[PDB]
């Protein structure tokens, strides 16, 4: 979408247009779910190091 | 052996006899490396519980 009128008044940090985020929105959730997961995986090691 | 003499004199605790200990040193080494083996094993276990 383009969110603007042609010729309008817009605010600094207003949003003028919009980049379909279906891949994007669907990468990063998809990163934050390994984050998740390797996350855990080493705070776990990081004790059966420790014994 | 039969180290006393038929008929002699014994003090309470004296050897009499001697019963072939080939395996009987064997199979006691053989225990002591099986505990030497387990009890590590138990030792670093109750760590782990422990966490």
Chains 1, 2 share one sequence.
Do not use: C, H, M, W
């Not at 891949?23 to 996350?39: F, P, V």
């Amino acid at each position: 979408k383009r969110l603007f009128k042609e010729g309008s008044d817009v605010k600094a940090g207003q949003q003028l247009y919009q980049i379909d985020p279906a891949t994007y929105e669907a990468d990063y959730q998809s990163a934050q779910a390994n984050l998740a997961s390797t996350q855990e995986q080493a705070q776990r090691y990081k004790l059966l190091v420790a014994d």
